[PDB]
Enzyme design. Structure first.
Site, PDB file in Angstrom:
ATOM      1  CG  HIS A  97       4.731  -2.092   0.046  1.00 46.64           C
ATOM      2  ND1 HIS A  97       5.404  -1.723  -1.100  1.00 46.64           N
ATOM      3  CD2 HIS A  97       4.358  -3.384  -0.133  1.00 46.64           C
ATOM      4  CE1 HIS A  97       5.416  -2.743  -1.942  1.00 46.64           C
ATOM      5  NE2 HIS A  97       4.787  -3.760  -1.380  1.00 46.64           N
ATOM      6  CG  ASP A 116       1.210   5.427  -8.833  1.00 49.74           C
ATOM      7  OD1 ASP A 116       0.149   5.999  -9.177  1.00 49.74           O
ATOM      8  OD2 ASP A 116       2.268   6.085  -8.772  1.00 49.74           O
ATOM      9  CD  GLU A 139       0.545   8.687 -11.338  1.00 43.96           C
ATOM     10  OE1 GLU A 139      -0.172   8.250 -10.410  1.00 43.96           O
ATOM     11  OE2 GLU A 139       1.667   8.213 -11.619  1.00 43.96           O
TER      12      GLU A 139
HETATM   13  C1  LIG Z   1       5.896  -0.613  -1.594  1.00 45.85           C
HETATM   14  C2  LIG Z   1       5.290   0.537  -2.374  1.00 45.85           C
HETATM   15  C3  LIG Z   1       4.624   1.545  -1.659  1.00 45.85           C
HETATM   16  C4  LIG Z   1       3.812   2.473  -2.332  1.00 45.85           C
HETATM   17  C5  LIG Z   1       3.653   2.387  -3.720  1.00 45.85           C
HETATM   18  C6  LIG Z   1       4.322   1.396  -4.434  1.00 45.85           C
HETATM   19  C7  LIG Z   1       5.129   0.469  -3.769  1.00 45.85           C
HETATM   20  C8  LIG Z   1       5.727  -0.642  -4.601  1.00 45.85           C
HETATM   21  N1  LIG Z   1       2.849   3.292  -4.396  1.00 45.85           N
HETATM   22  C9  LIG Z   1       2.183   4.288  -3.700  1.00 45.85           C
HETATM   23  C10 LIG Z   1       1.361   5.211  -4.354  1.00 45.85           C
HETATM   24  O1  LIG Z   1       1.247   5.200  -5.581  1.00 45.85           O
HETATM   25  N2  LIG Z   1       0.715   6.193  -3.624  1.00 45.85           N
HETATM   26  C11 LIG Z   1       0.874   6.262  -2.252  1.00 45.85           C
HETATM   27  O2  LIG Z   1       0.290   7.112  -1.591  1.00 45.85           O
HETATM   28  N3  LIG Z   1       1.682   5.354  -1.605  1.00 45.85           N
HETATM   29  C12 LIG Z   1       2.344   4.372  -2.317  1.00 45.85           C
HETATM   30  N4  LIG Z   1       3.152   3.478  -1.638  1.00 45.85           N
HETATM   31  C13 LIG Z   1       3.563   3.826  -0.228  1.00 45.85           C
HETATM   32  C14 LIG Z   1       2.564   3.213   0.760  1.00 45.85           C
HETATM   33  O3  LIG Z   1       1.379   3.985   0.810  1.00 45.85           O
HETATM   34  C15 LIG Z   1       3.204   3.091   2.141  1.00 45.85           C
HETATM   35  O4  LIG Z   1       4.191   2.087   2.071  1.00 45.85           O
HETATM   36  C16 LIG Z   1       2.210   2.791   3.269  1.00 45.85           C
HETATM   37  O5  LIG Z   1       2.920   2.601   4.476  1.00 45.85           O
HETATM   38  C17 LIG Z   1       1.276   1.602   3.008  1.00 45.85           C
HETATM   39  O6  LIG Z   1       1.979   0.378   3.050  1.00 45.85           O
HETATM   40  P1  LIG Z   1       1.512  -0.800   4.060  1.00 45.85           P
HETATM   41  O7  LIG Z   1       0.062  -1.032   3.920  1.00 45.85           O
HETATM   42  O8  LIG Z   1       2.369  -2.033   3.782  1.00 45.85           O
HETATM   43  O9  LIG Z   1       1.726  -0.219   5.549  1.00 45.85           O
HETATM   44  P2  LIG Z   1       3.061  -0.489   6.432  1.00 45.85           P
HETATM   45  O10 LIG Z   1       4.257  -0.061   5.679  1.00 45.85           O
HETATM   46  O11 LIG Z   1       3.154  -1.930   6.926  1.00 45.85           O
HETATM   47  O12 LIG Z   1       2.728   0.510   7.635  1.00 45.85           O
HETATM   48  C18 LIG Z   1       2.928   1.901   7.459  1.00 45.85           C
HETATM   49  C19 LIG Z   1       2.662   2.685   8.743  1.00 45.85           C
HETATM   50  O13 LIG Z   1       1.268   2.721   9.007  1.00 45.85           O
HETATM   51  C20 LIG Z   1       0.964   2.045  10.218  1.00 45.85           C
HETATM   52  N5  LIG Z   1      -0.213   1.192   9.958  1.00 45.85           N
HETATM   53  C21 LIG Z   1      -0.319   0.121   9.106  1.00 45.85           C
HETATM   54  N6  LIG Z   1      -1.596  -0.346   9.161  1.00 45.85           N
HETATM   55  C22 LIG Z   1      -2.304   0.428  10.013  1.00 45.85           C
HETATM   56  C23 LIG Z   1      -3.627   0.416  10.444  1.00 45.85           C
HETATM   57  N7  LIG Z   1      -4.465  -0.564  10.097  1.00 45.85           N
HETATM   58  N8  LIG Z   1      -4.046   1.364  11.347  1.00 45.85           N
HETATM   59  C24 LIG Z   1      -3.181   2.325  11.834  1.00 45.85           C
HETATM   60  N9  LIG Z   1      -1.876   2.325  11.405  1.00 45.85           N
HETATM   61  C25 LIG Z   1      -1.441   1.396  10.519  1.00 45.85           C
HETATM   62  C26 LIG Z   1       2.217   1.263  10.604  1.00 45.85           C
HETATM   63  O14 LIG Z   1       2.335   1.115  11.999  1.00 45.85           O
HETATM   64  C27 LIG Z   1       3.326   2.073   9.969  1.00 45.85           C
HETATM   65  O15 LIG Z   1       3.713   3.132  10.827  1.00 45.85           O
HETATM   66  C1  LIG Z   2       3.909   7.606  -4.043  1.00 41.40           C
HETATM   67  C2  LIG Z   2       4.593   6.389  -4.583  1.00 41.40           C
HETATM   68  C3  LIG Z   2       5.604   5.679  -3.730  1.00 41.40           C
HETATM   69  C4  LIG Z   2       4.305   5.945  -5.823  1.00 41.40           C
HETATM   70  C5  LIG Z   2       4.985   4.712  -6.368  1.00 41.40           C
HETATM   71  N1  LIG Z   2       4.554   4.346  -7.699  1.00 41.40           N
HETATM   72  C6  LIG Z   2       5.154   3.279  -8.275  1.00 41.40           C
HETATM   73  N2  LIG Z   2       5.969   2.423  -7.592  1.00 41.40           N
HETATM   74  C7  LIG Z   2       6.584   1.404  -8.222  1.00 41.40           C
HETATM   75  N3  LIG Z   2       6.427   1.201  -9.545  1.00 41.40           N
HETATM   76  C8  LIG Z   2       5.642   2.035 -10.266  1.00 41.40           C
HETATM   77  N4  LIG Z   2       5.397   1.940 -11.615  1.00 41.40           N
HETATM   78  C9  LIG Z   2       4.549   3.007 -11.830  1.00 41.40           C
HETATM   79  N5  LIG Z   2       4.270   3.739 -10.695  1.00 41.40           N
HETATM   80  C10 LIG Z   2       4.990   3.071  -9.723  1.00 41.40           C
END
Ligand SMILES: *Cc1cc2c(cc1C)nc1c(=O)[nH]c(=O)nc-1n2C[C@H](O)[C@H](O)[C@H](O)COP(=O)(O)OP(=O)(O)OC[C@H]1O[C@@H](n2cnc3c(N)ncnc32)[C@H](O)[C@@H]1O
Ligand SMILES: CC(C)=CCNc1ncnc2[nH]cnc12
Ligand SMILES: *[C@@H]1O[C@H](CO)[C@@H](O[C@@H]2O[C@H](CO)[C@@H](O)[C@H](O)[C@H]2NC(C)=O)[C@H](O)[C@H]1NC(C)=O
Ligand SMILES: *[C@@H]1O[C@H](CO)[C@@H](O)[C@H](O)[C@H]1NC(C)=O
Ligand SMILES: *[C@@H]1O[C@H](CO)[C@@H](O)[C@H](O)[C@H]1NC(C)=O
Ligand SMILES: *[C@@H]1O[C@H](CO)[C@@H](O)[C@H](O)[C@H]1NC(C)=O
Length: 479
Positions: A66, A130, A243
């Site tokens: 993500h 979220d 929010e």
């Molecule tokens: C896609 C997106 C992201 C998102 C969101 C809504 C959407 C549609 N809403 C969020 C929210 O409301 N609040 C918030 O804090 N974050 C929100 N996100 C962003 C999201 O937190 C980040 O994308 C985050 O990276 C989590 O996504 P994901 O689980 O898919 O992790 P990744 O992108 O593949 O990796 C991110 C980094 O972390 C390292 N990583 C991943 N897993 C681990 C573990 N198990 N241990 C140590 N490190 C880890 C990766 O190497 C990378 O650097």
């Molecule tokens: C911090 C972060 C990336 C929040 C993303 N939140 C969201 N991302 C995508 N769609 C949404 N609809 C309501 N909140 C939404």
């Protein structure tokens, strides 16, 4: 050893799948992708990396990819397909404790599944994102923020302990009581120090329902003062979640409809209101109360506020339906081919003292006269609920705002330029913001992000836990 067991894949389909992310802006092919069947496979990889002179490969841990700007890539390295750890039926990767006071979840597990497992035991985590299709390890490597964070802290403030395999290939259990240095480093640590294979998450008795409100403003000062009132320490007020969103005049009707909250009649009423007031920007607080008693409790809280009379909009839903609200948004947008598009998202924490200035320069300024697609989210957070000993970096003020401008994309270059312009405005105004979910590309920018003291700590932990600088190279901190 791993490859023969089919675990370390080098085929084009495997490398391609691990080369793109949700951002859909940058790409980087890995040399290989590990599909670990057990944590033993991860220990094997990291132990080999640690003990082999001339070890060639950086290592990233793909959660669900993500990331916005390649943070989960390992260019010419090894991506770990974390999801593989949850393939087996048994043993379970999510365990609610015997007394229901915590839940153990595999680092690869998505929060939606943590929710479901917890609700089966009458409990649920207190602090969310979220959007629930994110991994435990992924959000904990960042911070994990949503509307509950003002009162419970981010997800990193709701972890009791973790199992982490470091860059030395050592499996370590860490907490405030044991290996606290690693515990603090990993939380918000951007995958730099090791892989979280298990995290112990705080839970609370699960509420059944949420009364869910949106309140409309044309006045930013009233909007922000009311958000601050709702989230102020008394211990906190009655609201479970707070929010807010911003709606620019040009795409007002469209953006209001896109919330999924307002009906077409609701939208029409808000458009009419903005018109009579000649408002260039409309604001909405989004709040919930988890639970005729609700009616009076809500009425009492709303009575303290200053939203436009006639512009409180209510829904009443099952708690789980509220938490998973964005899943439905993804399904709808994906059907129209509007989900898997470039996401030049801008996320930052803006100190309270400068949020009005930010509103003036960005919402009333830069963003005016554009067609905005995607939510513009703004809400206050309380620093008291954050642990500054952890790696995550926040502004210095007691209150700072999450500002998440979730642009969906000739549009991409324009949006990228617009984001640069917003940051330029902030720098020139001397606003002491911190980025969130962004990677920086030179030393000075990263040092500024952390500040001198936290940077030096970050380096000390890097030398201790990942001396070869292999881990999560897509953050571009040590790579
Ligand atoms: C896609 C997106 C992201 C998102 C969101 C809504 C959407 C549609 N809403 C969020 C929210 O409301 N609040 C918030 O804090 N974050 C929100 N996100 C962003 C999201 O937190 C980040 O994308 C985050 O990276 C989590 O996504 P994901 O689980 O898919 O992790 P990744 O992108 O593949 O990796 C991110 C980094 O972390 C390292 N990583 C991943 N897993 C681990 C573990 N198990 N241990 C140590 N490190 C880890 C990766 O190497 C990378 O650097
Ligand atoms: C911090 C972060 C990336 C929040 C993303 N939140 C969201 N991302 C995508 N769609 C949404 N609809 C309501 N909140 C939404
Ligand atoms: C959930 O609890 C079970 C215990 O019932 C754990 O399963 C054990 O896991 C270890 C190694 O992870 C294995 O060696 C054991 O054979 C498993 N025992 C059983 C009974 O199957 C499981 O690890 C827990 N999950 C998490 C993420 O903590
Ligand atoms: C973004 O997604 C599209 C599919 O719409 C794909 O063709 C393209 O290669 C992706 N770009 C990146 C950099 O991930
Ligand atoms: C890490 O490598 C060093 C060799 O420099 C070795 O002493 C140590 O045993 C290794 N640890 C693991 C768990 O592989
Ligand atoms: C809002 O935008 C529309 C064009 O989309 C314009 O007609 C109207 O004047 C704008 N309202 C204000 C008060 O800026």
């Amino acid at each position: 050893a791993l490859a023969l067991d089919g675990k370390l894949r080098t085929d084009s389909n495997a490398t391609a799948a691990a080369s793109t992310d949700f951002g859909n802006i940058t790409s980087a092919l890995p040399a290989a992708v590990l599909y670990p069947s057990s944590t033993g496979d991860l220990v094997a990889l990291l132990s080999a990396a640690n003990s082999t002179p001339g070890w060639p490969y950086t290592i990233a841990f793909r959660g669900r990819g993500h990331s916005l700007m390649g943070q989960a890539f390992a260019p010419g390295g090894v991506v770990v397909n974390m999801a593989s750890l949850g393939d087996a039926a048994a043993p379970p990767r999510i365990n609610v404790s015997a007394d229901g006071r915590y839940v153990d979840a595999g680092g690869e597990q998505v929060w939606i599944d943590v929710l479901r497992a917890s609700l089966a035991r009458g409990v649920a985590p207190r602090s969310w994102t979220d959007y629930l299709y994110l991994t435990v390890g992924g959000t904990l490597s960042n911070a994990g923020i949503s509307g509950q964070a003002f009162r419970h802290g981010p997800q990193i403030s709701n972890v009791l302990e973790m199992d982490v395999i470091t860059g030395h290939g050592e499996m370590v259990t860490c907490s405030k009581q044991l290996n606290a240095d690693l515990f603090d480093a990993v939380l918000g640590g951007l995958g730099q120090f090791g892989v979280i294979t298990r995290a112990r998450i705080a839970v609370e008795p699960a509420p059944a329902r949420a009364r869910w409100v949106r309140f409309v403003y044309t006045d930013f000062a009233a909007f922000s003062a009311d958000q601050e009132r709702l989230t102020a320490p008394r211990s906190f007020g009655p609201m479970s979640y707070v929010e807010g969103s911003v709606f620019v005049n040009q795409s007002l009707a469209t953006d209001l409809a896109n919330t999924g909250f307002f009906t077409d009649a609701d939208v029409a009423r808000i458009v009419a209101l903005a018109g009579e007031r000649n408002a260039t920007t409309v604001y909405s607080i989004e709040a919930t109360l988890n639970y005729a008693a609700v009616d009076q409790e809500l009425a009492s809280v709303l009575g303290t506020l200053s939203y436009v009379e006639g512009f409180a909009f209510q829904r009443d839903v099952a708690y789980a339906a509220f938490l998973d609200r964005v899943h439905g948004e993804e399904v709808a947008l994906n059907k129209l081919g509007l989900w898997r598009v470039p996401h030049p998202w801008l996320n930052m924490f803006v100190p309270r003292s400068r949020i009005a200035d930010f509103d003036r320069g960005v919402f009333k300024g830069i963003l005016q006269g554009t067609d905005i697609v995607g939510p513009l989210i703004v809400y206050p957070l309380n620093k008291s609920m954050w642990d500054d000993g952890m790696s995550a970096a926040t502004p210095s003020e007691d209150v700072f705002y999450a500002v998440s401008l979730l642009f969906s994309s000739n549009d991409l270059a324009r949006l990228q330029e617009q984001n640069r312009r917003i940051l330029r405005f902030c720098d020139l105004a001397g606003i002491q913001y911190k980025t969130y979910l962004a990677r920086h590309t030179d030393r000075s920018d990263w040092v500024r992000h952390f500040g001198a003291a936290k940077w030096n700590r970050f380096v000390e932990m890097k030398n201790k836990y990942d001396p070869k600088r292999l881990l999560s190279p897509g953050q571009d901190i040590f790579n």
